[PDB]
Design a protein around this ligand. Structure first.
Ligand code: GNP
Ligand code: GNP
Ligand code: MG
Ligand code: MG
Lengths: 168, 168
């Protein structure tokens, strides 16, 4: 069938790069901010089952974040992304979390992603992210759209979680 | 949200220069006295919460101090500034304080600023300002619009205090 998935998080954390790296195996070194929202798709196989993922890449910019909250309701999966080199984007996850609860479904599967694990300039530790994840009650994973680490895992695991949910 | 902020204090203490240095990162070495009042704005980000600051730069000259007192009521933040190289401007803070209590709101957040910390001709010590601050019951900070020291801090901290007041 089809799974609607959203990527949310501060502007600059790498939502678009994780998406491009996953769907087109490329990486843009430049910063090309997302206006309002973007939409892509890819077919994944969940234990034999071929599932279509409709990925909604949202704008992190504050002004374009009203267009987004409207897409929350109806999403089967929501990926909250922060930048491990930017402490502010991590602290902001809590606010993103609240926004999600006010607009998402009940059965929506969340996932926290600490992106840019390839950077020596990291300021947010893996343990910090795991701790935030345990406190929010959602799964956690670190990634790097640049070196392509755990990028596919992000989407495959979220799909599997949603699918497991579909069986109940 | 909208935070209305006022800068008051004797003519010549540096109210306009702290404002210009904050909003346009410049510094006028010349003395261009303010006639009655002036008004500027800048968007500040208090903990991931972008707020608009409407800065009202008042005239220090005695003849205009009537056009100003009218703007007191309704201000959320009030910055009382004195010149550390001019003892008279510091002693006058007490009178400025009284004027504020007669015209400001109850929830108005005050802040005492000793400006021109870059001058070797200082005559008012930091301890003296701290003492006046403790006696008046308001926060204190020293700045230099010229060398750009604690200039942003003045406005960021006042906004944070007002916001903390808000989330209540
Ligand atoms: N080193 C490194 N840089 C990355 C990584 N992912 C993204 N970036 C860089 O970080 C910047 C922002 O990435 P981008 O994907 O555009 O961020 P966004 O979250 O989609 N921004 P917006 O919400 O404005 O649309 C870009 O210059 C990009 O190349 C990563 O894993 N490692
Ligand atoms: N050395 C030094 N001079 C400063 C500083 N701030 C302001 N000045 C100088 O003090 C003089 C008057 O500053 P100004 O900002 O106009 O003072 P004001 O409080 O706004 N005066 P008025 O109430 O009449 O409008 C100018 O010559 C200016 O360059 C500072 O931090 N350091
Ligand atoms: Mg983007
Ligand atoms: Mg002035």
């Amino acid at each position: 069938s089809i799974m609607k998935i959203l990527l949310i998080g501060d502007s600059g954390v790498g939502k678009s790069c994780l998406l491009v790296r996953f769907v087109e195996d490329k990486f843009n070194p430049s910063f090309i901010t997302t206006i309002g929202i973007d939409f892509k798709i890819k077919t994944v196989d969940i234990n034999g089952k071929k599932v279509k993922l409709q990925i909604w890449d949202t704008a992190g910019q504050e002004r374009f974040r009203t267009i987004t909250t409207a897409y929350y309701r109806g999403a089967m999966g929501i990926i909250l992304v922060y930048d491990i080199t930017d402490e502010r984007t991590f602290t902001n996850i809590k606010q993103w979390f609240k926004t999600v609860n006010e607009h998402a479904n009940d059965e929506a599967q969340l996932l926290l992603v600490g992106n840019k694990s390839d950077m020596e300039t990291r300021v947010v530790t893996a343990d910090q992210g795991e701790a935030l994840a345990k406190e929010l009650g959602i799964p956690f994973i670190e990634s790097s759209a640049k070196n392509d680490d755990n990028v596919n895992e992000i989407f495959f695991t979220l799909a599997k979680l949603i699918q497991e949910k579909i069986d109940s």
